[model samples]
Target chain A: TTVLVTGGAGFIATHTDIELLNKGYDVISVDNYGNSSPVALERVEQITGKPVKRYDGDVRDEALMERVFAENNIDWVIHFAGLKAVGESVAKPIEYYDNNLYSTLVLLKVMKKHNVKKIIFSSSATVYGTPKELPITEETPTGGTTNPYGTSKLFQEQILRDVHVADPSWTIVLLRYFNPVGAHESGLLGEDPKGIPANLTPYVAKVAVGELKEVQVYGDDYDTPDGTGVRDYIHVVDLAKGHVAVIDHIDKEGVFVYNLGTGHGYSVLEVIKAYEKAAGHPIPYAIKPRRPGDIAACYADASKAEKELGWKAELTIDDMAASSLNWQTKNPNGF
Target chain B: TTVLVTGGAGFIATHTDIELLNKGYDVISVDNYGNSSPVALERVEQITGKPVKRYDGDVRDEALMERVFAENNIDWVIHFAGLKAVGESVAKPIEYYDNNLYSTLVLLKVMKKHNVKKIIFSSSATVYGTPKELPITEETPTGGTTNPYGTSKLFQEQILRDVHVADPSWTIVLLRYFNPVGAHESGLLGEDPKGIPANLTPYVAKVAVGELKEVQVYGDDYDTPDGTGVRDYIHVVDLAKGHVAVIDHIDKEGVFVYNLGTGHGYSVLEVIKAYEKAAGHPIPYAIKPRRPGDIAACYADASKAEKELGWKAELTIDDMAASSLNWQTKNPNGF
Candidate 1:
């Protein structure tokens, strides 16, 4: 079976491209390279020894997207194209909403026209906002988003659900991922964010590799055991495998939502300690004033995914840190 | 001051166009005529004795919209474009979201490029969904929408609010209309829904004009005085006047939300009786099973607009009935 991956040069898409290829799926990937590099997908070819049929175009381009669908017999779609910086989203909300929502709308429109009815969407735990309770499940009430990035994810989930409601023939899966860290075990693929990273693990990786001076812990006064924010940090490879699990159940003809997390929580201090062990170096950090809307803890109750998709995250915090450090060390100037 | 009126050929846009012209504002109106007629704008010119700068095009077209802004120095924007049929929205949710959201996003993007930050958006009370309490004030919690049309409005509100938050210079007004009925006093313009009318007033109008056999009152077993669904019905002219008042306060910065209604609720039976008085004939009707998602009562407090914009609905139910009948009787075939 052949799969089309949008934003294929980005972190998750690159890793998932490898996983899909490993599973004997022909992959046609597209990326505008807005926040990614084409070289990352090139690296995927080196690692997997399978070339991705890549299109360097934005999904919002109807003509380009139409061409992609017409040229390739795409059996399934894994949509990961979006603007995802939370702080940048707050400052440029219109750009975030326009880029994220408009691209999804256009992709779905093209998918409808081509009758490609199976899709696995990249959603986020941020859709849950500050969870009313810990270990957010698939059934948690959504929409307390504080930034446009999170709102975009929430809106996407809603849009996909509504699309399925209107057309029951479509098979849709919304994977609400928690903190996805680490990298490919091959150390040839990893998160390569443009400029300074917005995510915690990447920022920590930069610190470990001596590319960054230090990591600023956003707050140290939260109510967690370490008095720092807590989160569910899953390995990126494990998250990629979650997408593969979704493909295994592609025959399901309805909207399904799953939390792709480890069902475990780790504090900021805990993660820093793990990274220090993996890197064999102390990562300098300073306690800064709490950012507005920062929560004490956020993790996932990922049992539904395990039970339904037969998928559970198998990597540990040390594994995440080690893999991430290896990739960072190899590609100090990220491809 | 010159104003850009999106969906300027629509029901409310025509009325608001007359009001804007009477106030000496130069109007540049754009409509794709997807759900409206260009004849409506011609009627606006007939009523005001002033020519409208009209463009027959959809707002989602970036080049067309960019040219509209580039060609005119638009001082304020009165956005009234969108699909309004709730049932149709449920069946074609993607269409509703795409047309509504994409058009708005393109408009905002163009407006930002042109440095025109004042906008009066035509929002709906449907954003409130089934109210948690009586007389939904502007402060009522939003987002229990069951259809894509309502969801589109909620999403637009959030987007506009975020825009204002990102740039405090934006003066945005979100007028949440509550069941706008009736027409201009000149009997020149009114709602002209195609196919089967989804709204009560248009359905009653069609039945009175002998275009339909009978009205199917969705539910007479609702928990109201006559065991029928109740709603706040505001006159189209009054709602248009609310748009004018927003222009009067266009210089104010930040996002402003207000409920535009008569602060009164009328049961379906009450509206039918009023229509009968205006039509001078008994409108035939049959009771059907309660439609799913139908609510018992919905009206607006509307105090926010009164206190903030110095606007309030003044027309009585008989006035609404008379004006609507006047338009329906004059134009047996909708313009």
Candidate 2:
């Protein structure tokens, strides 16, 4: 089977491309290289020894997308493309909403026209904005998003849900992922965002590799045990495998939602200490007042995915930290 | 001052065009005319004796929209362009979201480029789905929408809200309209939806004009005085004037929301009886079972708009019905 991956040059897209190729699924990718590099997908070829039929264009380009569907017999689509910076989204919501929502709408329009209805959308735990309960499940009430990036994801999820309701012949899976941070085991293909990173693990990785001076911890006085915020950071490889694991379920005729998290929470201190051990160095950090919308803790009860799709996040914090550090060390200047 | 009215051919657009011209504002219109007719604009010209600068194209076309802004010094924008049929939205959500959201995004982008930050969005009461409170004030909770049409409105509102938050220079007014009926007093312009109408007032007019059979009232067991679903139906002219009433407030650098409805509710039976009286004939309607997601009753406490914008819905239900009948009788076949 062949799959179409939108935003195919991004961090998770590159890793998922490798996993899909390893699973014997042919892959075609469409990307604008807006936030990612083509070299990452090239590294995927080196790692997996498989070619990804690539189209370097935006999904919002209707003519280019139509050409994609016409040229490739795509069986399913994994839409990972979108503008995702929270701070930037807050500053430029029009561009964020335009890029994110318009691209999804165009992709769905072309997918429906081509009758390629099976899709796995990259959603986020941010959909459950500041969850009222711990270990967020699939049934948690969604929609307290504070930024346009999160709102765009939730809006796309709702769009997908409505699409499935209209056409039941489509099989849709919405993957509400918790924090995903790590690289491929090869250390060649990993998160390679340009400029300073917005995520903790990558920022931590930069500091560990001596590329950055220190990590600015957003807050340290949260209600967690370590008095810092807690999150579920799954290894990127393990999270990538969840996509392949859920492929079998995609041929079914219904819409589904699953959380791709480790079902465990990690504190800021724990992650920093883990990275310090993995990198064999001291990662300097500073305490700062809390960001306005920063929450105390968030993780997932991913047992539903385990029970239903037989998939689980198997890697540990040390493994994730080591992978991230290795990637950062190898590519000090991000590809 | 000048106003740019998208979906310039729609039912409300025609009335609002007259109102805008009557208030001495130069009007420019951009519409695909996919669901509306250009004849309505022609009627506006006939009624007002003013020329409308018009672009015969969809707002999704960035080139067309950019040309529209470049050629004209647009002062304020009334974005009325979008697919609005509830049943059609359910059957074709991708089309609905694509047409609605993309058009709005493109308009925002072009407006930003042109430095025209004042906008009046044509929102709907459907955003407040199945209201849990009587007289849905501007503060009533929104977003239990069952169809994509409503969801698109809510999504657009969120996008606009985020846009305002990002760039506070924008003066955005989201006018959530209740059911708008009636027509231009000249009987030359009104809602003339293709195929059978999905709304009550238009269907009653069609039956009164002998173009259709009896009306099919969706439910009669709703919890109300008359046991039929109740809604706040306002005259198209009064509803149209609300657009002009809020324009002065759009110069401020903030986001605002107001409910545009007569602060009262009328049962379906009441509307049918009113239409019959206005037509001077007996109207026939059969009670059908309840629609799955139909709410029992919803009106608006538009006192907020009255107090803040000094606007109120003055046209009564009889006026709405008489104007509707006047339009139907004049044009047996809709323009």
Candidate 3:
């Protein structure tokens, strides 16, 4: 069995590629390296002892996509190629929508042409948008996205749903992931953002490693237990394994949505304390004004995945913090 | 002044091209004619007694669109190129999204590259999606779309809004048209749906001209005054003029949305009676079970367009019926 991974050089894609390779699935990895690095693929091979067929091209390039589909007997697609920056998306929405949505549309077009009917889509819990209630389930209404990044994910999910409805032969798993933190346990592959990290865990990792001076906590008046925002921080390796489980679990032809998270919530202060324990130092931070559109809390009701796919997050917050620190400390300049 | 009209050979685009040419705006028309005919551009020239520069290509063709932008000093863009069938979209959503959203994205990308910052998008009231209230205003939340066609329009609206937000220099007008249902007064250019018409007016036109047996009114038990669904049917010429108004009205850099309709709704029976009067014969019909996503009543509050764009629909339902019958009579087989 072989799986085609779009944006295969990115954080989750790198981990998932290793997971797929270790599980004996031949991997075909493609990425433009817009938000990632080609070296990540090299690291994946080192970690897995298995080689991946790599392509340095975009998913939206029809000719390249055609070649990719034609050359590989790709049985399933793990689509992860997209721009993920919320602030950058707001500043350059056309680029975001054009790159993100166009990539998915073109990939699906190629997949349909090649008769590759099964897909594991990388979606985000940001689609839930402020969450009307605690612990959002897969059945949550997904619409109130405030940024183009989130909106693009919501649009992609809708497009996939419509595609499945139009042709039920297409098996699809839309994994709406919550906050994915941490790194591979090997300390070889991890989240390596291009510039200043947009996510909290990487920034926290940098702060802990003394590469960054301090963390600017976005808000402290959010109505949570510690007056800080809360999120379901799942280990990246655990998230990667969830993808493997989904690929193995989809037996029938239909659309399935699952929330991939730890089913636990961690406040910002809690995360900082965990990182402090991992690094043996206090990560200095300052409270700032609440970011516009920031929600007080957002975790996941990940019971669906556990029940159906037989997959659950086993790593704890300490594990996530320690692994993230491990990867950051070993490779101060992330490959 | 010059304008580049995408899908310029289609129904609304044809009428709008004539209006633009009559108003002395140099017209450059591009259409693949997937759902239209090149003859409509010829009829548009015949109607206006002015020549239109025509290109035969799909809007998703980036190279072709780049050439269109390079060859023409497009001062404004009137985007009407997209698939618009509800049922077909439900069945072939990938085609619908690929055609509709890809066209818009490619067009906008080319426009940005060429520094053409003004656009008049052909949006539909379907974005309002089963309106919770009558006289749907522009402020109505736009989400409950049931098919890929409606979803595409809604997505385009968001894309344009984001484009304007990202760069305040871009001026955009989203004309959420109510049901457009008439031909040019000269009977030269009109709607020429290839298959069984999805809309009520063209379907009724087919019935009036003896080409079709009868109109199947989707439902008659809705909570409407006449126990039938009601819609704000605006004349195509009037709707076309609304585009002209938008082109002339935009002076600043911002996104504008307006509802273009007569602000008067007619029931299914009312429309049949009006068509009967115009055709000088009664049109037969039978009420079938309601279409899956059909709403009770949907009309527009045209006051915003009137106040902002200095435009209003002057033609009545009688005019819509007359012009539609006139075109159907002249061209039994559509041009």
- Highest-scoring model, DockQ: 2
For every candidate in turn, the CA RMSD to the true structure comes to 1.9, 1.8, 2.4
Please give the range of 10 consecutive residues that has the lowest summed lDDT in model 2 chain B.
B289-298
Candidate closer to the true structure by lDDT (higher is better), 1 or 3: 3
The runs of at least 3 residues in candidate 3 whose Cα sits more than 4 Å from the true structure, single-residue gaps closed, are: A219-228, A284-294, B212-228, B284-293
Candidate 3 structure quality by residue, lDDT tens digits, A144-175: 88788989999999999998888899898999
- DockQ of structure 3: 0.78
Error of 2 at A95 (Å): 1.5
TM-score of chain B of each: 0.97, 0.97, 0.97
Instruction: Give the runs in model 2 whose Cα sits over 4 Å from its true position.
Output: A225-227, A288-293, B288-293
Better of 1 and 3 by DockQ: 3
Candidate 2 DockQ vs. native: 0.91
Predicted complex 2: CAPRI docking category: high
Q: Whole-model lDDT, candidate 2?
A: 0.89
Q: Quote the TM-score that chain A achieves in each candidate.
A: 0.97, 0.97, 0.97
TM-score of each model, paired residue for residue: 0.96, 0.96, 0.94
Q: List the residue pairs that clash in candidate 3.
A: none
Q: Flag the better candidate by TM-score, 1 or 3.
A: 1
lDDT tens digits by residue: candidate 1, A1-335: 88999898999999999999988999998898887899998889999999899899888898999999999999999999998877678888888888899899989999999999999999988888879877788888998898888988998888888898889999999999888899898898899988888878888989999999888888888888889999999988999999998997658799899999998899888898999999888999888887654668889999999988899999999999999999999998788
Q: Please give the CA lDDT of all the candidate structures.
A: 0.89, 0.89, 0.89
